[PDB]
Amino acid sequence: FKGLDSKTFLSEHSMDMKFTYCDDRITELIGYHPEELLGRSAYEFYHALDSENMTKSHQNLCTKGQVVSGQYRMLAKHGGYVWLETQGTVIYNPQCIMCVNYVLSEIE
Amino acid sequence: CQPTRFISRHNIEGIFTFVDHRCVATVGYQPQELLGKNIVEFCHPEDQQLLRDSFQQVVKLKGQVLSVMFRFRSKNQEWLWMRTSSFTFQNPYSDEIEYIICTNTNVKNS
Numbered sequence: 001f002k003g004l005d006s007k008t009f010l011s012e013h014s015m016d017m018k019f020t021y022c023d024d025r026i027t028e029l030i031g032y033h034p035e036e037l038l039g040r041s042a043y044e045f046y047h048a049l050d051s052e053n054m055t056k057s058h059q060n061l062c063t064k065g066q067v068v069s070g071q072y073r074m075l076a077k078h079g080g081y082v083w084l085e086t087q088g089t090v091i092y093n094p095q096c097i098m099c100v101n102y103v104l105s106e107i108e
Numbered sequence: 109c110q111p112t113r114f115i116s117r118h119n120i121e122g123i124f125t126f127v128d129h130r131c132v133a134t135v136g137y138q139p140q141e142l143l144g145k146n147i148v149e150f151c152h153p154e155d156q157q158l159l160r161d162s163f164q165q166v167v168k169l170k171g172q173v174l175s176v177m178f179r180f181r182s183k184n185q186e187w188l189w190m191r192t193s194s195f196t197f198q199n200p201y202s203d204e205i206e207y208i209i210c211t212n213t214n215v216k217n218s
């Protein structure tokens with residue numbers, strides 16, 4: 001089983017929530033290649049049961065500037081759903097969203 | 109045009125612990141030319157103190173964004189104006205020391 005650190009990765013997003021960048025660490029955790037994430041909305045990946053709430057986390061973020069998601073599931077690359085928690089921050093000059101993403105589920 | 113900009117992580121002293129490869133187009137260096145060195149080493153002597161005081165304050169600000177502007181020395185030997193927006197992260201399941209997450213963008217001073 002992996003340390004909290006080895007289960008933590010960063011993602012960057014435009015204001016529409018498309019990925020603009022993602023740590024390679026996401027590969028050993030969830031399966032995706034950061035390359036394949038760019039231009040796709042985070043929305044594509046949330047479990048239907050978490051979507052309305054992630055939308056409300058998004059609103060809190062845009063209006064307040066920083067947020068903690070609390071728990072949501074992300075569709076894995078090769079089937080199934082990994083639990084996560086994300087802390088989000090808006091960088092204004094709004095210019096982008098920095099996400100620190102922590103995988104709740106156990107890895108290894 | 110999107111500003112160029114790269115992400116980095118630092119310890120509370122200022123040492124690069126992680127560098128986004130978008131650094132190449134932004135400042136000229138490979139990630140491994142930054143990793144392990146203090147960001148203060150790449151900073152203009154008039155700006156070095158501001159930047160050390162910036163890293164000292166970002167940890168007292170309760171995870172909120174602190175921004176700083178300073179001149180960073182590219183590998184192409186020029187002083188680039190940098191806007192660095194940083195904040196601390198601390199995983200709330202743990203009591204590990206916080207570290208500092210930075211976005212670094214070449215901006216205009218004018």
Ligand SMILES: N#Cc1cc(F)cc(Oc2cnc(C(F)(F)F)c3c2CC[C@H]3O)c1
Pocket residue numbers: 011013017042043045046054057058061067068069073074075086087088089097099101
């Ligand atoms: N599934 C998924 C997923 C995974 C990731 F690694 C990041 C991500 O994106 C977000 C996660 N939480 C958040 C939020 F801050 F809302 F919690 C946000 C985003 C994109 C912008 C923002 O709404 C979504």
